Ligand binder design. Structure first.
Ligand SMILES: Cc1cnc(Nc2ccccc2)nc1-c1c[nH]c(C(=O)N[C@H](CO)c2ccccc2)c1
Length: 331
């Protein structure tokens, strides 16, 4: 009769069903472990979250759970089970049990050089999942290599819907946020450029520095690029800077597929109104060997929070989380 499991200090109370726990990753208010499921006889992923001390985290937790419960797609992580205390008073932690993936794009690009065909295949799958997300009228807002999970057969699944909506990792952040579905396309362009070189394309240290990196490759902005209700400090700064020449894609990425760079160019478009859309991305020549619109499903209906979660006190959100996960409790 073994007690509570433990990984790197903190307790994982996942009972007799889930054992053999092993560290695989972490977040701002939780940790993800692999575990042996003694019912399905496979290893699974278990995401522990402890968000109740903060309203923002309770929001993120509830959003993710709701979205993932609803969503059903081959390239998006699902939820198989949820564990928490039998009463709300003892609920200090929530455990989301999910399909175990082998690794993520972050770690893979750390150790491995991708061939053009695998770059092409990963990008196809990113866009195939994103299409579904966007068809549901949801924005992911935090697309980046560590939120892309992979298995042995090169299948890919998008994870971490905490920031998702009907403040994020700066390197992959669209320019307009620092100055809509188009923000997710920018992030995907950033990811594509990273698969092509194994390095982040715009590794900025803070918001203005982030804009500086983007402009150091795209060149100084046109007036039409800039006229868009920008923050006054940013606009004053951007106007102050010396001219920057555009660096040609084929010079940043010397051995890259020419079709890949054409799509890159269309994703990394400064003006969000000019930037390529997910369905258009899928239909670009570069993805042609994989493009199959009868095998790229959309969500059954757009997603909707009928409660305005932003205004809700964290005690109310905790009650909602208790209610949302009741369906998984014994009985
Ligand atoms: C759900 C999942 C399944 N399988 C794997 N495999 C894996 C990934 C990297 C290395 C080795 C194996 N990972 C996951 C998973 C990865 N990240 C998350 C996740 O939701 N992370 C967020 C931060 O990105 C998070 C974690 C804990 C608390 C709050 C947020 C789940």
């Amino acid at each position: 009769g073994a007690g509570p499991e433990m990984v790197r200090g903190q307790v994982f109370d996942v009972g007799p069903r889930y054992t053999n726990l092993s560290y695989i990753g972490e977040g701002a208010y939780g940790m993800v472990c692999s575990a042996y499921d003694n019912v399905n006889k496979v290893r699974v992923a278990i995401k522990k979250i402890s968000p109740f001390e903060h309203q923002t985290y309770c929001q993120r937790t509830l959003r993710e759970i709701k979205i993932l419960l609803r969503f059903r797609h081959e390239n998006i992580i699902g939820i198989n089970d949820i564990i928490r205390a039998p009463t709300i008073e003892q609920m200090k932690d929530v455990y989301i049990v999910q399909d175990l993936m082998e690794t993520d794009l972050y770690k893979l690009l750390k150790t491995q050089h991708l061939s053009n065909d695998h770059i092409c295949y990963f990008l196809y799958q990113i866009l195939r999942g994103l299409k579904y997300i966007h068809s549901a009228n949801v924005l992911h807002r935090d697309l980046k290599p560590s939120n892309l999970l992979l298995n042995t057969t090169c299948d890919l699944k998008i994870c971490d819907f905490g920031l998702a909506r009907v403040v994020a990792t700066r390197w992959y952040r669209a320019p307009e946020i620092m100055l809509t579905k188009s923000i997710d396309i920018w992030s995907v362009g950033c990811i594509l450029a990273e698969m092509l070189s194994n390095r982040p394309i715009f590794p900025g240290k803070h918001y203005l520095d982030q804009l500086n990196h983007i402009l150091g490759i795209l060149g100084s902005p046109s007036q039409e690029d800039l006229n868009c209700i920008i923050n006054l400090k940013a606009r004053n700064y951007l106007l102050s800077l010396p001219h920057k020449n555009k660096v040609p894609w084929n010079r940043l990425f010397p051995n890259a597929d020419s079709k890949a760079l054409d799509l890159l160019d269309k994703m990394l478009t400064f003006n969000p109104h000019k930037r390529i859309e997910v369905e258009q991305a899928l239909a670009h020549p570069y993805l042609e060997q994989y493009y199959d619109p009868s095998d790229e499903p959309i969500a059954e209906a757009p997603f909707k929070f009928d409660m305005e979660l932003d205004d809700l006190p964290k005690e109310k959100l905790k009650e909602l989380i208790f209610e949302e996960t009741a369906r998984f409790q014994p009985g």
